[PDB]
């Protein structure tokens, strides 16, 4: 079939998305696994959408959708609230993310023999976190104000970072894919240390440039004074993708850049008392509307990601490695998190921290990166990265997300009473 | 790969923003600014690979159009249609087709091209979109009913302006797509077959259209979905469903989507059935949904215009503007009136001359500008030399530009000097 | 596989061609059906070459190969020898070709219900003749000098003409494919008469223009005086394809044009006694070499055509309609020819003509046009021309060529003694 | 579709003919005339769509090359090779590679491009083909052995000039094709891995080459085929077989074919086995076959050159000729000698300087000119920006032109002033 098949796919996607959201609206079950299972049914079960096409879309979505999503997530948070607990988090992401990634790598490595790189990329994928399916649930069981903040921040920050780790890990697996400066710093200064140097490098660059472009955007809106639709929205998207582009060109993760810009505009209010208020309020409201708009967009993107992930998976590989994946998953949930969150114990009680450690689930970003290695393997051949291992990784990640979301979402309340 | 895409989207959207700025503060209509800026971005700076832009255009040509026409379908009043339904119907069937033919004759006798090619050009330049005229309407206080009938004309010509292109296109491909139209053409000749095919198309499209609209509303009732993002996802879903099925039955999915848009945009009808209580809520929810979609459609519009700007090549358009302008003036001065003269029986002569004269060509042709060239270049069909493609496309560009601008300058003079 | 699969295909083609030619060199059996069967084996039997790829090549070959072949065939004959029997032949081709085409159309029509057009195109395909596999055989059994000439001429002339009929017939089946002037003359003056008017038209145009370009070529070689390789060869090809191009642009069969040019250069010797002989002999020999070269080329092309035809066929359709095809074939052989060659009886005896009528076989051109309708059906969809009918036509043609060549080649000698 | 193709072939071949004419009567070498005429035909007249020409080039790049290199393999003397085999081997391995590297350094420091891109450029401009020099050789009476070693250098550099390109190309594609070279690069680094890969390639290619050659001759004996067209079909068949299998085992099929060409061209060897009676006949049959194939190869050569002429775009080449010429002079004056200095140990200094200086770049680079651009444009690989492609290609054009012409003008002066 021709591009009308793509449209058909689109309709099926959105429709099923709506349906699933209805299920969640009508049943306390999180919408994520519903999305996934729905994708599975709509895909492999009924062969309505083929995996090849599914992936063909999935790359596009993997880019744009994630950009929008991350940007918006950038918009959502509040800098004061994060500054409140700033020292805690930076370590938390940096150490946790990497440590979780590394240890799970070791974890993955044992279950199926693989060069570390494979494991490390697995963890790098599972790196990110998404308690977006818990945030409502927290309010639903009188969860304290304080921790929700730091967790939210953790997710919003680690989402792009998991990618970086992933892109780093992948770059290690395939020579040409690695950017220039990484290659240089690697050959020159080893891979272990090179990873770190490039880490601090691209992080610093990305965040700084993100700030730059962000405030530049703010000033632009200031002078231009665009309070009316749709130019503000268009400008927003253009800005995000700009940050992403430039960021990626300079061998950095443009995702983090855009995200950062989102944080800026989302939490930047600098003005001279000489300035009128006729414009500040207009820009405020404008920003608000644009934000909500992109919230909708990001929602769409999210739905796409989960469902497509659903129709992406190969049942055979899954079932074949069903159990193993499970062990890996629960293992990750109950070992990777607590062990990588140990060095925060000096800030909260042996009981207190246990919650936030044991609670962290895995969602969007890893769901979107599950097919990436497979994508490459299909696109480019490499002995280090077999297609086989691609399918394996993807399957395991699927299981991981499922298990994580389900178990965490289910066992939240029990924790509360049993800890507070 | 995707990096270049990101760059492109960035500069396009940014471009659009800037263009809306300069249009805002200079008061000039935004469209020509769009086209010219796109011109800058593609060929002038050589920043954008024309062919990639062509790919993106291949993307937008269906989806952007679907969305745009859907939202257009929303912004409609069934009542105001009901008032002048015969005027409209006469204007969008007979008038449109006649316009196509006439334009065809023009193109033929100006380029020595085959009449089929000319007719293709006509079909492409059929649809109109005077969204830029509206502010001038409410500003110079043009009579309401006129504005209404013109608008309602556009909303209907946009999708009908598409099928006719697909017709001529299908006529160029020797196999005729092996579709219904092929058969009809074989059993009754191309003319008759074409007519019957048209009627089939429109009929089924509208029936299935209102069908899906109703099914949609009903679905909302049973499901009771009133919140973002569920409602929007639903809307898009329905749109593309309509389109997909539409084309699946060889009918203009665009027409279908538009019709569904009409349904939703004009559905306070089954309100007295259920308690109005929740119904008001769904009404306003639909309203905000519509607004959102309006924004989307605006975006897609920007895409289309700017991309059209970038895709053209100055060599051809220059070498052929000397004739091109003449073609444009030609259609503006001859095609519309001769096609709208049957409408003289209902309305006044002055009113007639006005509504005929004021006929700007907008988005839809721009979206179909590259289409013949694309099909020619891709399918490598013998009847469609690529040069012909460039010719048509350029001609379309000229036409659009000139039409939009002089129509935009017509009003103040055109009103007072006759009405 | 990538374009190396095409190369593989090439090797297989030529190799098997060589093999088959060895068989014919080592066994009196004509090389044509050997080629075909070889193609069948190498194709459908072993799936070494897929039908899709096979056809993809087959279009290319269908063009260029035929051009070269027809051109060379143009070169081969001698104008004096044809002028000897000129009145006989013109009628013979014109009437026979059309009549054979028409009657076989009726013949095809009865065996399987079809609109005439289908039958007419069948006959149009079977139109051409190729006794190239008999020409040696004639010498092998002391066949008289006279008839071989007229038959040779008949083939060389009817080969392009069968195409025209075919292209005409096809054009009738698919609207857009028909050229401009045919369309006009058809709508204006009916299809029956339109066919004739366009026939005389494009024939006259093609032959005239062919002469023009031909002598133009001769003069060019004269002034330029290119006696050395390879410029003469390149120029030859360029000329042929030129004639073909221009011919096709003016809604005429460029094949016939090129062929005609070939006839010209092959048999044109005009010079002033004032002119030296140092150049005439050089151009003579040059022409000779170029001719032989293109003979080789044409041979290659021929091999391609037959073998690819072999790997093109669908065994299922064949077997399904095996018998029917046979009846059609022998029917054609024993009815179409004699009945369409009746009006030459006023020139030769009731016995004499019977030979040349009953002997005409069908070869190259029809072998190359067997897949054309199918080609279109696959490329373009049309209710009048189903893919089904495409496969059918192709199969029937295959059977026809096989049967024709085999039976004629086998039963030649018996005729001689039993008639002379 | 095919109509345009026919037009193209017509004008190309005709063009070639004319070019050979003007080259014949003006005495000037035919190659630059080829390139310039192609220039006329493609961009100048806009007669030929550059991209279609690119397609055709994609066709010729394998087949034309296979034939050309095969026939080249024929025209060879095993004896004369045996004489200076070490000189040759040293010249085609170490010398060639060194030339590539040096050119790479140049390209890098002149365009700021990555060293890999430069090296790609080097690999492309590696191979040489001085077929235009031969007449000047026999005319100005250059020493025989020199001519021989240079020729035998070319015949071997042509295919080796290809693999190195495929190397750098493979290096650009991140997956490295997942081939042997990938593995070797992973286990031993790109340098070592590349070397070992090279040795593997050459070894297997030659072994299998002579294998197929022998198998070919033997086949002829058993089959006793001495006549057109059987013999020719056979030849081509064998060539493409060699190529196919060659590439199937990730080896340069070009190298294989060339080697088989060497085998056939130099096989009077097993004559004393069988009665020479029929053997003389097969010998001469092989001779005429070779001649035929020579004609073919000439044709393909014309194709390649003219097409190269048509494919380029004057904008880029102009905007970058200022540097381009410098790059060319650069390689001619620096790359060869520094790469041929190890050959100083065998031959005299004057002879060395001569054979080094006189190093024209011919067909093979021209065939690989568009290849990086093609792969970049098609695969859309991130490391290969299309602009880079245009740059490389143009640079190659400049290089070829200048090299050929100044080398062609070198000889008369270059001989007497030092030898
Ligand atoms: C700018 C002019 C003032 C207008 C403010 C715009 C609305 C911002 S307030 C904005 O409202 C949402 C939908 O009503 C609420 O979202 C809530 O989430 C709940 C979680 O199950 C759902 O029941 C929703 O129905 C809603 O009650 C609230 O969490 C959010 O903060
Ligand atoms: C121009 C200088 C003189 C050289 C003349 C070139 C050769 C032209 S003569 C040219 O020779 C062919 C191959 O030997 C012959 O072809 C013959 O056909 C026979 C049919 O089974 C085969 O046995 C062949 O071996 C050969 O004897 C002959 O029919 C043809 O006419």
Automatic annotation (TrEMBL), chains B, D:
Chief place of localization: membrane
GO MF, one annotated term: antiporter activity
Annotated keywords: Antiport, Cell membrane, Ion transport, Membrane, Transmembrane, Transmembrane helix, Transport
Membrane topology: Multi-pass membrane protein
Cell compartments where the protein resides: Cell membrane
Domain (Cation/H+ exchanger transmembrane) ranges: 12-414
Protein name as it appears in the record: Na+/H+ antiporter, putative
Source species of the chain: Pyrococcus abyssi (strain GE5 / Orsay)
């Amino acid at each position: 079939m021709i591009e009308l098949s793509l449209a058909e796919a689109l309709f099926l996607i959105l429709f099923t998305g709506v349906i699933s959201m209805l299920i969640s609206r009508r049943t306390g079950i999180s919408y994520v696994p519903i999305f996934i299972l729905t994708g599975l049914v709509i895909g492999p079960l009924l062969k309505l959408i083929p995996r090849d096409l599914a992936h063909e879309i999935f790359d596009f979505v993997r880019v744009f959708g994630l950009v929008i999503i991350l940007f918006t997530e950038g918009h959502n948070l509040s800098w004061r609230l994060l500054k409140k607990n700033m020292p805690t988090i930076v370590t938390l992401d940096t150490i946790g993310l990497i440590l979780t990634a590394l240890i799970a790598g070791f974890i993955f490595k044992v279950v199926f023999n693989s060069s570390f790189l494979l494991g490390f990329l697995f963890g790098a994928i599972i790196g990110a976190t998404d308690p977006a399916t818990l945030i409502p649930l927290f309010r639903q069981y009188r969860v304290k104000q304080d921790i929700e903040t730091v967790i939210v921040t953790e997710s919003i920050f680690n989402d792009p970072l998991g990618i970086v780790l992933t892109l780093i890990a992948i770059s290690m697996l395939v020579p040409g894919y690695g950017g220039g400066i990484f290659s240089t710093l690697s050959e020159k200064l080893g891979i272990y240390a090179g990873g770190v140097i490039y880490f601090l490098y691209n992080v610093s660059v990305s965040i700084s440039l993100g700030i730059f472009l962000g405030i530049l955007g703010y000033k632009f809106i200031k002078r231009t004074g665009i309070f009316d639709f749709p130019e503000i929205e268009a400008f927003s998207l253009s800005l995000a993708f700009l940050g992403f582009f430039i960021g990626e060109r300079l061998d950095a993760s443009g995702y983090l850049v855009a995200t950062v810009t989102g944080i800026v505009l989302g939490n930047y209010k600098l003005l001279k008392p000489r300035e009128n208020i006729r414009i500040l309020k207009r820009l405020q409201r404008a920003i608000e509307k644009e934000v909500h708009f992109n919230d909708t967009l990001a929602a769409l993107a999210t739905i796409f990601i989960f469902v497509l992930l659903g129709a992406e998976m190969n049942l055979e590989v899954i079932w074949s490695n069903l159990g193993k994946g499970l062990l890996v998953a629960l293992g990750v949930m109950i070992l990777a998190r607590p062990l990588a969150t140990l060095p925060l114990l000096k800030w909260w009680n042996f009981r207190e921290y246990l919650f936030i450690a044991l609670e962290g689930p895995r969602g969007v970003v890893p769901s979107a990166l599950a097919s990436l290695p497979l994508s490459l393997a299909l696109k480019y051949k490499s002995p280090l990265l077999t297609v086989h291992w691609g399918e394996i990784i993807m399957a395991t990640v699927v299981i991981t997300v499922l298990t994580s979301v389900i178990v965490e979402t289910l066992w939240i309340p029990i924790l509360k009473d049993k800890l507070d």
